[PDB]
Design a protein around this ligand. Structure first.
Ligand SMILES: [Ca+2]
Ligand SMILES: [Ca+2]
Ligand SMILES: [Ca+2]
Ligand code: NA
Length: 466
């Protein structure tokens, strides 16, 4: 009985609905009656053309602000090069108006869309915090298609205020259910960057999203890491189609690309999911993604089955998001139990790394205590170590159930001698596994060079329930 969009460009939005069973299954969600009505999404970027003909109808001033110039109007700054078109492109993917004879449609075409202009100027910790913490009781989902430079040699993440914003967000946002923070995993594929060296994507508070090309391949710009949760389609080679969305100066583009285009699609799907169940907590949402994402059709060299029978890849997380499945499961979802946190400091003495180091430890996961965990969610391996050439290292963490998460792959451009200072490598690959038993940390020098260093701290942090 449902009638799909009549927008001129909808037919080119192959990732929304296609006759090749290779899409995000969004129409199936629309058919179930979910379009994002009542949900508020904010694009933290370089601004949003609120008067765009395909955005005006859904624009929401309450979900917007201009942090760069300190005013409530997020309108982009116009320049000959059209530098500030990025946010507007991301906004359209989420909530471009449907059936209005203009361009295409957003995943959640009935959602309210806002924008925080915060990338067009000096991006400080304060700027980030004010953006991430904007109207936490009005805005439901925040979408961020930006982050530290992807040079493949830096390790960076949120400073204190931003961290506090994230924490206040998942704790108090949405009336206590927790703000949903969607993040683009990065464009450093060519520089061999790792998204675990990015504190925004690596955070447990954000749903880090990767990309897949139309033919189901890992895009050239893709960054692999264990912190990524799932994937949505984006651009690839010139024979593959790209993302169709709203563009600056009230135009329509068919060439929105890279990691930037994936997060917004995920944000939209999540918007449909919240409409299906407004009581989902920020953790419930991550559970739904893990459970409903599909690996099938996606090509990767590292698909592996984890302790609970789910396929995972460092390039895709649990696979392609499935809107229809997300909204279906949301309806019968029982809120998960309170989050427990079990801290296990492993080292009793510094360990020399040399060519290879292996650290084994049998844990009880806080058995007999209030934070006993039998069903894992995120896991972090907080490491502190020194090394002469950081990029030559590769670090892996194996769960008692045999799931091997690569916390860090070699980064050839990383010649840093500063090592890692209590860096919290995170993995989503052992989600739902029982964490008790022997864990193994492996650190290896992937180069033939005679490198040296010392691992001074290894704290295993488990989040989950019983
Ligand atoms: Ca302004
Ligand atoms: Ca439209
Ligand atoms: Ca990166
Ligand atoms: Na994350």
């Amino acid at each position: 009985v449902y009638q799909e969009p009549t927008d001129p460009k909808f037919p080119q939005q192959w990732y929304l609905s296609g006759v090749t069973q290779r899409d995000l299954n969004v129409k199936a969600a629309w058919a179930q009656g979910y379009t994002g009505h009542g949900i508020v999404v904010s694009i933290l970027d370089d601004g949003i053309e609120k008067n765009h003909p395909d955005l005006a109808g859904n624009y929401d001033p309450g979900a917007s602000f201009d942090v760069n110039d300190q005013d409530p109007d997020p309108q982009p700054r116009y320049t000959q090069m059209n530098d500030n078109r990025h946010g507007t492109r991301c906004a359209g993917e989420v909530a471009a108006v449907a059936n209005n004879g203009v361009c295409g449609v957003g995943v959640a075409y009935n959602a309210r869309i806002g924008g925080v202009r915060m990338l067009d100027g000096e991006v400080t910790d304060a700027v980030e915090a004010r953006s991430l913490g904007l109207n936490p009781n009005h805005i439901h989902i925040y979408s961020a298609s930006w982050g530290p430079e992807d040079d493949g040699k830096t390790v960076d993440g949120p400073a204190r205020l931003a961290e506090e914003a994230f924490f206040r967000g998942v704790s108090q946002g949405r009336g206590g259910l927790g703000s949903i923070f969607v993040w683009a995993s990065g464009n450093g594929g060519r520089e061999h960057d790792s998204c675990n060296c990015d504190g925004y994507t690596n955070s447990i508070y954000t749903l880090s999203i990767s990309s897949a090309t139309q033919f189901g391949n890992v895009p050239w710009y893709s960054e692999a890491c264990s912190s990524t949760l799932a994937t949505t389609y984006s651009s690839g080679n010139q024979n593959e189609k790209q993302i169709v969305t709203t563009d600056l100066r009230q135009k329509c583009t068919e060439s929105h690309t890279g990691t930037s285009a994936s997060a917004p699609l995920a944000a939209g799907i999540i918007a449909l999911t919240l409409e299906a169940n407004k009581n989902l907590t920020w953790r419930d949402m991550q559970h739904l993604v893990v459970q409903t994402s599909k690996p099938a059709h996606l090509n990767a060299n590292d698909w592996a089955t984890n302790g609970v029978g789910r396929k995972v890849s460092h390039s895709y997380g649990y696979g392609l998001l499935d809107a229809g499945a997300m909204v279906a499961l949301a309806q019968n979802w029982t809120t998960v139990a309170p989050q427990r946190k079990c801290i296990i400091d492993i080292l009793t003495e510094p360990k020399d790394i040399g060519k290879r180091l292996e650290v084994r430890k049998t844990v009880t996961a806080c058995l007999g205590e209030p934070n006993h965990i039998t069903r894992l969610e995120h896991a972090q391996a907080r490491l502190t170590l020194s090394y002469n050439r950081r990029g030559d290292l590769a670090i892996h963490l194996v769960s008692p159930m045999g799931t091997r998460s690569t916390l860090l792959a070699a980064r050839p451009h990383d010649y840093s001698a500063d090592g890692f200072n209590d860096w919290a490598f995170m993995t989503t690959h052992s989600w739902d596994e029982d964490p008790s038993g022997e864990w193994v940390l492996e650190i290896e020098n992937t180069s033939e060079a005679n490198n040296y260093g010392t691992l001074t701290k290894f704290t295993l942090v488990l989040y989950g329930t019983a």
